[PDB]
RNA sequence: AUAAUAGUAAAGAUGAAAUAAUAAUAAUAAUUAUAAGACUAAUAUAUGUGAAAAUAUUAAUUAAAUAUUAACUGACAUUGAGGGAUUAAAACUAGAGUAGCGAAACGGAUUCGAUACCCGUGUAGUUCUAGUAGUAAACUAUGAAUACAAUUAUUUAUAAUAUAUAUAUAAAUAAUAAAUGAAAAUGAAAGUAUUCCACCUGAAGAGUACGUUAGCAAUAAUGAAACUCAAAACAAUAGACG
């Protein structure tokens, strides 16, 4: 009927409210899986190797060098998956 | 630094007006004090300037003249406020704080 | 100022529906039907 | 041109350079 | 049957357009060259592929 | 009216960087009388939860463990060093309320750590943890980091 | 292996035509557009045009500018 | 200039989150009505969280009532009332933003044109018809 | 409808993979001795069910000590690309 | 017809002349303003090769002189100098122009 | 960087240690409070826009920019010596600021030596306002414009035939035919032609000396001759070497 009482019946939403997605709960029975998750939940956000870029500065031309060589690596790499799978399929149609 | 002729400025030293007392409702209730708190060329106490503010011609006691800080391109910051003990930190152009 | 006042009470009053977008409501056709209305 | 000629050039613009920081106190005297 | 490298001339079509306009002036279009069309591969199309479909 | 605090969870963070391991186990401690006593507003209340306090209990590196200068960045200082924040639990026996476990940059002892955690020697200590995250740290903006390495 | 994801295709409203950048005030939409810590995703994973691709972008990052996200 | 502004109004009275969103609303929409402009729609987003806690006006604010406003007013007069949405303590975060009138002068704000409705018109044609 | 595009690549000197990955079974002597162990940790060391897991590594060690490896094959996709790449790259006529 | 085009392109400068005036620091405007005044004088020679009539009817209902459409117009500094479109002084003569001019005030009897 | 709470004996760097900071408050690490300078994460391709230099955290004011149609005008166009404006980083002149990085300097390292590559402290600089100067591998090492010439694939925009995305026209990119080329290769051009401007005539001397011009200055522009020589240079081929 009066303040801060009710508030304690809120708090755990106000906490939860507030989340910066990183957030992860480890089953009880086995750990394995929930390091291995988070493991790979790093790797997507790609925070493992940009702070190990972060380290040290780079000059802006090499960093735009370097950007336009792993974007043509990638297209490559797709290009040629692509490629590999026409090829296959090939195979089994009997070519 | 920027005064010229036609500008208006105001001491607030015995504090808050009528004309904002009576104007509380809408001078008091929405803090609009800030607009005239922290202006160039008026004086307030201390303690109603916010932490930050360039001042200058500071006083060392209440019912003393300002002694600081007065000569030409001279100016003052303002750190800490401590109501308890009835004093505040005033970073000094020398650099001391006082 | 009176249509302030008004619009202002209509918006804020606790019975207006307020729309927080919580979820994605479910449920145009009134406007083309005035159209054809007010066309043919 | 290559990094042959380029190379000439470096050094060439590099000793004249040495030679006018050397000649600084000559130059002030002769110039007022 | 349709048929390749003719233009309608401005002086061929004296009514207004769909939108009531008059055209009096040739347009962009007709200020190109369509040396291609003549030698591009025509595309054959029949109304029975729509009835198929 | 009286201040009455006491603890909740336990916070273990653990940073592992080229050079060095430091894994710091603290305690969260709140007080319940806090919200007892009035004057306190709903946004005191909430930036007081929001907020825990947090008090250090046992902070040590892999150089309280016998490594010295060079040894302090590899795989097995921080393997017992983990093992030693463990038993140190284990003896201090904190383990009474779960264990939030926050974590930093890589270095090289997070393998260590998430080894031992899930070793046998860990085995009796994660039933004792409930939620994991990481910190590790990044800059949106600028510091000028230092130049490069010509090594 | 050829698992498709057209149910996004159905579901993503941002390829059925809507102007992006409108949505700005609407911060769940945007929501799925980002990762856990928001980040946006690459053109290669919403799959968008360059043009919406693009106005989404710019919706998000204003959409964090009022605070919202 | 059609203007379109987010507001998120600070609440420290948590009995009554429209309150000071009330007076705020009052005041501004009577700054910019006397000011040659006109209100064209004013509804608000609810009670909402902040995603991180922003601390302004000596305070650590973790929530806000979030509110919408469209009008019209001349750029000199707009932008001070910018001016005093950012010096005013009572709001915590605030952005106006214009919306195009070249090709329809009657615009509806942002989140009306999200939905299939995109104009004054056709909100009230809807209420109308479904009325 | 509006799916991302098809990038091709420019003409190669060969289509080929470095280090493809061929199709290969596990000898399961070493899976009969992860089961083992499991068992150790659970039950206990050489307890009476481990016995049964015990008997199937006596098993499977007697003769080898991965028992019998066969089925060692290699992907001929190599063969495959280099045979019809000049058809399938779509290259212009000459 | 030229003199409409003109016309419709002295709007344009007044405008953006005052903006430049606004904001001395942009320098494609400042470039886009010396592109358009060119523009104004180029049409205008051919409205005196074709109908010096209108030619000078418009250039004097305008504020602008044959001088001013005929000789080279660069925008240069000077310009803005000698006709005070800010009011402060952009390029510096020399000592050596600087006392030439000086020598060169005679204050002759005459 | 400062302060507080707890909390220990080590922390930081390196291939490894010391230079600088620790149990004199008592660090390092963790959690909080305050100030400051700088920068801008995915998006992302600098895509794209811009005359170039440049240009991606958000909103606003001003100016410019695209395609189609209608009308208008009437060869009013292209190039452009001289000239004018803008021009990265460094540099200089006043005034603010200086968190982090960092010429120089001083120390610690490796080496026989190390005036360096590695480590510490780190002044100028790096930042904002007003300026000076007008230079770069300022590069597509490729001036602008016009007419034309055979194909393919992917994106972007326009047009209603539609029934609910097939059909034609423009631009960019990527691979080519012909052509060109010393070849590597170019492939709306480095092809077929026309017009205008800038520049070249062996190497070294030398973009040096002298003169002049301009700058606060560093310098920028212009710019020779004497002595010597039968050299000098590019593409590609085959080895040897790493
Ligand atoms: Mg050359
Ligand atoms: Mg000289
Ligand atoms: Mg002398
Ligand atoms: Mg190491
Ligand atoms: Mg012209
Ligand atoms: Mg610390
Ligand atoms: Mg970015
Ligand atoms: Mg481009
Ligand atoms: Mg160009
Ligand atoms: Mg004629
Ligand atoms: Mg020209
Ligand atoms: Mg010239
Ligand atoms: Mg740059
Ligand atoms: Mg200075
Ligand atoms: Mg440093
Ligand atoms: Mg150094
Ligand atoms: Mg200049
Ligand atoms: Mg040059
Ligand atoms: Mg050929
Ligand atoms: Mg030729
Ligand atoms: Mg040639
Ligand atoms: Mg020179
Ligand atoms: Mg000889
Ligand atoms: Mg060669
Ligand atoms: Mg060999």
Same mark, same amino acid.
Request: net charge positive.
């Given at each position: 009927?009066?303040?801060?009482?009710?508030?304690?019946?809120?708090?755990?939403?106000?906490?939860?409210?507030?989340?910066?997605?990183?957030?992860?709960?480890?089953?009880?029975?086995?750990?394995?899986?929930?390091?291995?998750?988070?493991?790979?939940?790093?790797?997507?956000?790609?925070?493992?190797?940009?702070?190990?870029?972060?380290?040290?500065?780079?000059?802006?031309?090499?960093?735009?060098?370097?950007?336009?060589?792993?974007?043509?690596?990638?297209?490559?790499?797709?290009?040629?998956?692509?490629?590999?799978?026409?090829?296959?399929?090939?195979?089994?149609?009997?070519? | 630094?920027?005064?010229?002729?036609?500008?208006?400025?105001?001491?607030?030293?015995?504090?808050?007006?009528?004309?904002?007392?009576?104007?509380?409702?809408?001078?008091?209730?929405?803090?609009?004090?800030?607009?005239?708190?922290?202006?160039?060329?008026?004086?307030?106490?201390?303690?109603?300037?916010?932490?930050?503010?360039?001042?200058?011609?500071?006083?060392?006691?209440?019912?003393?003249?300002?002694?600081?800080?007065?000569?030409?391109?001279?100016?003052?910051?303002?750190?800490?406020?401590?109501?308890?003990?009835?004093?505040?930190?005033?970073?000094?152009?020398?650099?001391?704080?006082? | 100022?009176?249509?302030?006042?008004?619009?202002?009470?209509?918006?804020?009053?606790?019975?207006?529906?307020?729309?927080?977008?919580?979820?994605?409501?479910?449920?145009?056709?009134?406007?083309?039907?005035?159209?054809?209305?007010?066309?043919? | 041109?290559?990094?042959?000629?380029?190379?000439?050039?470096?050094?060439?613009?590099?000793?004249?350079?040495?030679?006018?920081?050397?000649?600084?106190?000559?130059?002030?005297?002769?110039?007022? | 049957?349709?048929?390749?490298?003719?233009?309608?001339?401005? =002086?061929?079509?004296?009514?207004?357009?769909?939108?009531?306009?008059?055209? =009096?002036?040739?347009?962009?279009?007709?200020?190109?060259?369509?040396?291609?069309?003549?030698?591009?591969?025509?595309?054959? =199309?029949?109304?029975?592929?729509?009835?198929?479909? | 009216?009286?201040?009455?605090?006491?603890?909740?969870?336990?916070?273990?963070?653990?940073?592992?960087?080229?050079?060095?391991?430091?894994?710091?186990?603290?305690?969260?401690?709140?007080?319940?009388?806090?919200?007892?006593?009035?004057?306190?507003?709903?946004?005191?209340?909430?930036?007081?939860?929001?907020?825990?306090?947090?008090?250090?209990?046992?902070?040590?590196?892999?150089?309280?463990?016998?490594?010295?200068?060079?040894?302090?960045?590899?795989?097995?200082?921080?393997?017992?060093?983990?093992?030693?924040?463990?038993?140190?639990?284990?003896?201090?026996?904190?383990?009474?309320?779960?264990?939030?476990?926050?974590?930093?940059?890589?270095?090289?002892?997070?393998?260590?750590?998430?080894?031992?955690?899930?070793?046998?020697?860990?085995?009796?200590?994660?039933?004792?943890?409930?939620?994991?995250?990481?910190?590790?740290?990044?800059?949106?903006?600028?510091?000028?980091?230092?130049?490069?390495?010509?090594? | 292996?050829?698992?498709?994801?057209?149910?996004?295709?159905?579901?993503?409203?941002?390829?059925?035509?809507?102007?992006?950048?409108?949505?700005?005030?609407?911060?769940?939409?945007?929501?799925?557009?980002?990762?856990?810590?928001?980040?946006?995703?690459?053109?290669?994973?919403?799959?968008?045009?360059?043009?919406?691709?693009?106005?989404?972008?710019?919706?998000?990052?204003?959409?964090?500018?009022?605070?919202?996200? | 200039?059609?203007?379109?502004?987010?507001?998120?109004?600070?609440?420290?009275?948590?009995?009554?989150?429209?309150?000071?969103?009330?007076?705020?609303?009052?005041?501004?929409?009577?700054?910019?009505?006397?000011?040659?402009?006109?209100?064209?729609?004013?509804?608000?987003?609810?009670?909402?969280?902040?995603?991180?806690?922003?601390?302004?006006?000596?305070?650590?604010?973790?929530?806000?009532?979030?509110?919408?406003?469209?009008?019209?007013?001349?750029?000199?007069?707009?932008?001070?009332?910018?001016?005093?949405?950012?010096?005013?303590?009572?709001?915590?975060?605030?952005?106006?933003?214009?919306?195009?009138?070249?090709?329809?002068?009657?615009?509806?704000?942002?989140?009306?044109?999200?939905?299939?409705?995109?104009?004054?018109?056709?909100?009230?044609?809807?209420?109308?018809?479904?009325? | 409808?509006?799916?991302?595009?098809?990038?091709?690549?420019?003409?190669?000197?060969?289509?080929?993979?470095?280090?493809?990955?061929?199709?290969?079974?596990?000898?399961?002597?070493?899976?009969?001795?992860?089961?083992?162990?499991?068992?150790?940790?659970?039950?206990?060391?050489?307890?009476?069910?481990?016995?049964?897991?015990?008997?199937?590594?006596?098993?499977?060690?007697?003769?080898?000590?991965?028992?019998?490896?066969?089925?060692?094959?290699?992907?001929?996709?190599?063969?495959?690309?280099?045979?019809?790449?000049?058809?399938?790259?779509?290259?212009?006529?000459? | 017809?030229?003199?409409?085009?003109?016309?419709?392109?002295?709007?344009?400068?007044?405008?953006?002349?005052?903006?430049?005036?606004?904001?001395?620091?942009?320098?494609?405007?400042?470039?886009?303003?010396?592109?358009?005044?060119?523009?104004?004088?180029?049409?205008?020679?051919?409205?005196?090769?074709?109908?010096?009539?209108?030619?000078?009817?418009?250039?004097?209902?305008?504020?602008?002189?044959?001088?001013?459409?005929?000789?080279?117009?660069?925008?240069?500094?000077?310009?803005?100098?000698?006709?005070?479109?800010?009011?402060?002084?952009?390029?510096?003569?020399?000592?050596?122009?600087?006392?030439?001019?000086?020598?060169?005030?005679?204050?002759?009897?005459?």
């Amino acid at each position: 009927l009066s303040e801060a009482e009710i508030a304690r019946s809120s708090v755990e939403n106000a906490q939860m409210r507030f989340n910066s997605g990183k957030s992860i709960i480890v089953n009880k029975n086995n750990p394995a899986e929930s390091f291995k998750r988070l493991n790979r939940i790093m790797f997507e956000n790609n925070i493992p190797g940009d702070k190990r870029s972060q380290r040290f500065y780079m000059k802006p031309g090499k960093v735009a060098e370097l950007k336009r060589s792993q974007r043509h690596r990638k297209e490559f790499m797709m290009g040629f998956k692509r490629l590999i799978e026409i090829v296959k399929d090939a195979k089994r149609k009997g070519y | 630094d920027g005064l010229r002729p036609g500008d208006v400025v105001e001491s607030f030293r015995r504090g808050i007006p009528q004309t904002l007392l009576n104007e509380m409702g809408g001078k008091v209730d929405p803090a609009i004090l800030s607009v005239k708190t922290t202006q160039r060329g008026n004086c307030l106490p201390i303690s109603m300037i916010p932490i930050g503010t360039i001042i200058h011609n500071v006083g060392i006691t209440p019912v003393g003249p300002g002694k600081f800080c007065r000569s030409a391109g001279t100016y003052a910051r303002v750190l800490a406020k401590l109501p308890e003990k009835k004093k505040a930190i005033v970073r000094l152009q020398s650099g001391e704080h006082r | 100022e009176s249509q302030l006042l008004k619009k202002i009470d209509k918006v804020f009053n606790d019975e207006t529906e307020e729309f927080t977008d919580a979820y994605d409501v479910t449920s145009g056709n009134t406007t083309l039907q005035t159209q054809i209305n007010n066309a043919i | 041109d290559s990094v042959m000629r380029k190379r000439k050039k470096k050094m060439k613009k590099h000793k004249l350079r040495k030679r006018r920081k050397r000649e600084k106190a000559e130059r002030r005297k002769l110039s007022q | 049957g349709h048929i390749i490298g003719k233009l309608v001339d401005v =002086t061929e079509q004296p009514h207004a357009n769909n939108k009531g306009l008059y055209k =009096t002036r040739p347009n962009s279009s007709d200020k190109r060259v369509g040396v291609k069309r003549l030698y591009r591969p025509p595309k054959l =199309t029949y109304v029975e592929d729509r009835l198929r479909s | 009216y009286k201040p009455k605090e006491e603890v909740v969870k336990y916070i273990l963070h653990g940073k592992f960087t080229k050079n060095n391991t430091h894994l710091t186990f603290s305690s969260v401690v709140e007080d319940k009388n806090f919200h007892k006593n009035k004057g306190l507003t709903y946004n005191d209340t909430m930036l007081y939860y929001l907020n825990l306090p947090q008090k250090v209990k046992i902070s040590l590196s892999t150089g309280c463990l016998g490594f010295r200068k060079a040894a302090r960045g590899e795989y097995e200082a921080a393997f017992q060093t983990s093992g030693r924040m463990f038993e140190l639990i284990k003896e201090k026996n904190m383990l009474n309320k779960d264990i939030e476990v926050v974590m930093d940059d890589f270095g090289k002892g997070r393998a260590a750590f998430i080894s031992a955690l899930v070793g046998k020697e860990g085995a009796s200590v994660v039933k004792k943890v409930v939620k994991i995250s990481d910190a590790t740290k990044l800059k949106f903006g600028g510091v000028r980091s230092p130049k490069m390495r010509r090594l | 292996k050829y698992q498709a994801n057209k149910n996004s295709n159905r579901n993503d409203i941002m390829k059925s035509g809507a102007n992006p950048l409108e949505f700005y005030a609407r911060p769940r939409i945007l929501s799925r557009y980002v990762t856990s810590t928001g980040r946006i995703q690459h053109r290669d994973i919403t799959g968008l045009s360059a043009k919406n691709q693009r106005r989404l972008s710019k919706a998000i990052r204003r959409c964090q500018a009022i605070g919202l996200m | 200039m059609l203007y379109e502004l987010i507001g998120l109004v600070r609440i420290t009275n948590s009995n009554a989150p429209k309150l000071e969103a009330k007076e705020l609303s009052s005041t501004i929409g009577k700054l910019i009505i006397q000011n040659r402009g006109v209100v064209r729609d004013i509804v608000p987003m609810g009670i909402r969280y902040l995603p991180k806690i922003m601390k302004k006006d000596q305070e650590k604010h973790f929530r806000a009532y979030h509110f919408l406003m469209l009008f019209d007013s001349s750029a000199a007069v707009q932008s001070e009332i910018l001016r005093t949405l950012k010096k005013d303590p009572r709001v915590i975060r605030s952005s106006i933003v214009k919306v195009d009138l070249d090709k329809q002068l009657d615009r509806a704000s942002s989140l009306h044109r999200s939905l299939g409705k995109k104009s004054i018109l056709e909100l009230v044609n809807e209420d109308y018809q479904s009325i | 409808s509006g799916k991302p595009p098809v990038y091709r690549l420019p003409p190669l000197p060969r289509l080929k993979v470095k280090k493809p990955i061929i199709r290969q079974e596990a000898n399961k002597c070493l899976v009969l001795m992860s089961n083992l162990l499991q068992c150790w940790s659970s039950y206990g060391h050489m307890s009476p069910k481990c016995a049964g897991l015990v008997t199937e590594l006596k098993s499977c060690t007697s003769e080898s000590a991965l028992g019998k490896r066969n089925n060692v094959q290699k992907s001929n996709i190599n063969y495959h690309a280099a045979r019809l790449y000049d058809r399938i790259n779509g290259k212009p006529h000459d | 017809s030229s003199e409409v085009q003109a016309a419709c392109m002295t709007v344009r400068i007044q405008n953006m002349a005052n903006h430049i005036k606004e904001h001395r620091k942009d320098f494609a405007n400042t470039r886009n303003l010396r592109i358009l005044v060119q523009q104004r004088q180029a049409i205008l020679r051919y409205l005196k090769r074709d109908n010096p009539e209108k030619y000078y009817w418009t250039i004097q209902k305008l504020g602008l002189n044959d001088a001013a459409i005929t000789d080279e117009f660069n925008m240069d500094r000077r310009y803005m100098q000698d006709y005070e479109f800010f009011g402060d002084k952009i390029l510096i003569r020399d000592s050596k122009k600087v006392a030439n001019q000086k020598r060169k005030e005679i204050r002759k009897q005459k």
